[PDB]
Amino acid sequence: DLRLHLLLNTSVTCNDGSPAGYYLKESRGSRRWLLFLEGGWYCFNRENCDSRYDTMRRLMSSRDWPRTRTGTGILSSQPEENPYWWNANMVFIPYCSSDVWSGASSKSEKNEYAFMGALIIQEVVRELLGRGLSGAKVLLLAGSSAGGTGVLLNVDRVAEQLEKLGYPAIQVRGLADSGWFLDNKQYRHTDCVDTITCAPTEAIRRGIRYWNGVVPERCRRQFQEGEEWNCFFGYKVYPTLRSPVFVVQWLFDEAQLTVDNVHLTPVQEGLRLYIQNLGRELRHTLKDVPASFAPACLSHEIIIRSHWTDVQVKGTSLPRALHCWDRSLHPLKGCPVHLVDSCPWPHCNPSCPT
Numbered sequence: 001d002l003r004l005h006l007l008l009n010t011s012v013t014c015n016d017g018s019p020a021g022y023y024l025k026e027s028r029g030s031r032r033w034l035l036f037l038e039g040g041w042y043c044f045n046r047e048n049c050d051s052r053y054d055t056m057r058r059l060m061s062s063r064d065w066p067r068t069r070t071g072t073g074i075l076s077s078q079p080e081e082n083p084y085w086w087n088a089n090m091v092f093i094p095y096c097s098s099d100v101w102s103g104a105s106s107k108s109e110k111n112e113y114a115f116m117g118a119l120i121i122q123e124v125v126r127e128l129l130g131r132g133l134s135g136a137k138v139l140l141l142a143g144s145s146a147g148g149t150g151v152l153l154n155v156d157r158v159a160e161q162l163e164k165l166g167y168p169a170i171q172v173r174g175l176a177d178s179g180w181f182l183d184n185k186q187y188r189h190t191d192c193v194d195t196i197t198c199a200p201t202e203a204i205r206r207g208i209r210y211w212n213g214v215v216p217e218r219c220r221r222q223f224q225e226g227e228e229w230n231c232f233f234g235y236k237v238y239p240t241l242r243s244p245v246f247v248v249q250w251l252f253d254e255a256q257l258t259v260d261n262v263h264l265t266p267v268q269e270g271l272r273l274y275i276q277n278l279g280r281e282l283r284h285t286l287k288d289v290p291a292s293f294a295p296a297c298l299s300h301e302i303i304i305r306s307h308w309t310d311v312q313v314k315g316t317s318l319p320r321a322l323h324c325w326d327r328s329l330h331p332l333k334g335c336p337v338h339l340v341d342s343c344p345w346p347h348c349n350p351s352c353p354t
């Protein structure tokens with residue numbers, strides 16, 4: 001169990017102005033720190049944020065958060081469940097800003113909601129330095145789904161924050177799970193007039209303006225004013241990053257298929273070619289990513305699932321691949337770090353989740 005702490009700086013808030021926070025379980029015999037970013041889509045105007053506040057309020061407010069959380073998967077402290085980092089200091093940062101962790105805007109008489117995701121991460125890091133993070137050797141910033149994209153958007157800013165605060169010895173690294181998407185053509189499509197019809201690129205473009213969203217500086221300088229939405233897409237922002245980042249991505253991600261208007265519910269030839277081309281394109285974007293784990297499965301998220309130990313690529317599990325990554329940051333015989341399936345159809349890998 002990890003224990004809730006609400007942020008001492010109460011000006012760093014969830015959507016509705018309640019304080020943000022983090023759950024923490026300390027491991028005094030360890031100088032490794034894992035900070036995990038929760039996911040859960042986003043909202044991008046008044047209308048659909050109001051809807052989200054009715055039926056997804058824990059993603060917009062801390063008023064109903066429980067006092068403890070059980071760590072699962074990579075956040076578990078039992079070696080049977082977590083072969084990788086079971087003895088680490090564990091932190092779960094709830095997603096209550098609805099901004100893919102990019103926002104820097106307070107609630108005001110102009111703004112019905114606050115979008116403070118980028119500032120929440122910075123304030124959590126600041127307050128943890130007083131609770132033992134000052135002695136760390138590695139800070140691993142991890143996340144799933146919207147939290148995985150949040151890793152890509154924030155890992156270099158955490159590294160810069162610790163450098164400017166006088167801790168140049170802490171090695172900052174990233175682990176992005178299920179946050180690597182393609183701005184591809186949809187299988188069926190519609191013009192953006194409402195939430196159901198707005199393609200990812202157009203919805204993110206509106207969100208960035210609504211949130212006062214922030215992107216990494218080198219990426220921002222490449223694409224420039226009005227085009228910051230490009231930096232939400234992994235294959236475009238990753239080459240601009242300096243911190244080591246490990247990328248976990250199902251080749252047939254259920255959220256990718258959702259935004260592409262694909263439902264698997266007898267597949268004819270047009271859809272067969274579409275699905276095979278999506279897998280090939282995703283594989284192409286990872287070809288020069290040296291730390292990656294990409295199985296040929298239809299699924300979504302993995303690193304905080306308890307059975308995350310089950311899936312294998314070329315005979316190597318995800319906990320093993322992450323351990324090999326650790327060794328590489330001190331090729332290795334029999335301990336690989338780049339693992340991408342080559343078979344072209346969902347569940348052609350027999351270790352895929354059922």
Ligand SMILES: *[C@@H]1O[C@H](CO)[C@@H](O)[C@H](O)[C@H]1NC(C)=O
Binds near residue numbers: 011
């Ligand atoms: C609280 O957080 C806000 C937003 O990041 C910042 O402007 C302010 O300086 C912080 N307050 C303190 C006392 O650090």
Ligand SMILES: O=S1(=O)CCN(Cc2ccco2)CC1
Binds near residue numbers: 039179
């Ligand atoms: O799809 S998600 O789980 C993770 C990514 N975010 C924003 C996004 C959409 C496309 C690219 O980046 C939405 C929720």
